[PDB]
Design an enzyme around this catalytic site. Structure first.
Site, PDB file in Angstrom:
ATOM      1  N   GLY A  40       5.162  -3.272  -6.107  1.00 36.78           N
ATOM      2  CA  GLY A  40       6.998  -3.891  -5.725  1.00 36.78           C
ATOM      3  C   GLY A  40       6.361  -2.794  -4.433  1.00 36.78           C
ATOM      4  N   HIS A  46      -3.171  -5.911   1.844  1.00 37.49           N
ATOM      5  CA  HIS A  46      -3.221  -6.332  -0.019  1.00 37.49           C
ATOM      6  C   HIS A  46      -2.366  -7.109  -0.291  1.00 37.49           C
ATOM      7  CE1 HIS A  46      -0.893  -2.971  -0.762  1.00 37.49           C
ATOM      8  NE2 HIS A  46      -0.736  -3.306  -1.811  1.00 37.49           N
ATOM      9  N   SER A  91       4.906  -1.636  -2.359  1.00 37.44           N
ATOM     10  CA  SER A  91       3.313  -1.681  -1.033  1.00 37.44           C
ATOM     11  C   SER A  91       3.848  -2.739  -0.093  1.00 37.44           C
ATOM     12  CB  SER A  91       2.591  -2.568  -1.972  1.00 37.44           C
ATOM     13  OG  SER A  91       1.859  -1.805  -3.393  1.00 37.44           O
ATOM     14  N   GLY A  92       3.917  -1.918   1.506  1.00 36.25           N
ATOM     15  CA  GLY A  92       3.642  -2.282   2.363  1.00 36.25           C
ATOM     16  C   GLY A  92       4.859  -1.774   2.815  1.00 36.25           C
ATOM     17  N   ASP A 131      -5.653  -0.016   5.221  1.00 37.71           N
ATOM     18  CA  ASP A 131      -4.806  -1.418   4.361  1.00 37.71           C
ATOM     19  C   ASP A 131      -3.596  -1.258   5.310  1.00 37.71           C
ATOM     20  OD1 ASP A 131      -3.480  -2.782   2.346  1.00 37.71           O
ATOM     21  OD2 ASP A 131      -3.313  -0.919   1.223  1.00 37.71           O
TER      22      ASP A 131
END
Ligand SMILES: COC(=O)[C@H](Cc1cccc(C(=N)N)c1)NC(=O)CNS(=O)(=O)c1ccc(C)cc1
Ligand SMILES: [Ca+2]
Length: 223
Positions: A175, A40, A177-178, A84
């Site tokens: 912020g 995402h 995420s990932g 994801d």
């Protein structure tokens, strides 16, 4: 990161910042040419920033490399966020050193109870907004699927796991995420989603990396 602490300059060498004019997601360096992040977090025109601490000041150990290719997982579902995960290949191989290093992929999954390190430049407030310029760290355990689902009513798949504290107060956030979830020296998770941040009975949800090692290895060998 909510309720975490200042990691310390380059103490998490495998942490990367995805930049498209500004920081928008975190990522993990798995080798000199590849980074793993969340699906995402996909966007075009990604520039990978390695060796970072304060993302607003050039401190001297940074390496800015453009992405030459991005590969979102074949079964990624933006509606539920199942699968994801995404791989990003760098235009030129990064220079590995004491401040820029890769993180190892898992050989097997991690059991509930295991302690993990989560890091990122995301929002630090539970009820408000405040973005740090320095990397924040957070130690949190893996929660059992049963206790997670029972407490949150979350719809979780076998490709996700929850980590955090049911009492709230500590969690990943916008912020982050990932970003990486490292447990026992291995990259076990990718910051995926959650409900608000650091809320009671609402722990963070992460992509279960151990389920994608084959795809990752195959994809990097052929690309
Ligand atoms: C709830 O509001 C948000 O903005 C959260 C923040 C966030 C991001 C990453 C981790 C946490 C965390 N608490 N550990 C929180 N984002 C999201 O959660 C992601 N985008 S989302 O809110 O659009 C979303 C969430 C769940 C599904 C099935 C689909 C889409
Ligand atoms: Ca910097």
């Amino acid at each position: 990161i909510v309720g975490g602490y200042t990691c310390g300059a380059n103490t998490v060498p495998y942490q990367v910042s995805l930049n498209s004019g500004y920081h928008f997601c975190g990522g993990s360096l798995i080798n000199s040419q590849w980074v793993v992040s969340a699906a995402h977090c996909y966007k075009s025109g990604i520039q990978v920033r390695l060796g970072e601490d304060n993302i607003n000041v050039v401190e001297g150990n940074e390496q800015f490399i453009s992405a030459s290719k991005s590969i979102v997982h074949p079964s990624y579902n933006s509606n539920t966020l199942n699968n994801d995960i995404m791989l990003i290949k760098l235009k030129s191989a990064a220079s590995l050193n004491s401040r820029v290093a890769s993180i190892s992929l898992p050989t097997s999954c991690a059991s509930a109870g295991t302690q993990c390190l989560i890091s990122g430049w995301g929002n630090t407030k539970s009820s408000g907004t405040s973005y740090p310029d320095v990397l924040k760290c957070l130690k949190a355990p893996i929660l059992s699927d049963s206790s997670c689902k029972s407490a949150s009513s979350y719809i979780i798949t076998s490709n996700m796991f929850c980590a955090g504290y049911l009492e709230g107060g500590k969690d990943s956030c916008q912020g982050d995420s990932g970003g990486p979830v490292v447990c026992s020296g291995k990259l076990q998770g990718i910051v995926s989603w959650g409900s608000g941040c650091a809320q009671k009975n609402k722990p963070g949800v992460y992509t279960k990396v151990c389920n994608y090692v084959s795809w990752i290895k195959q994809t990097i060998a052929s690309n």
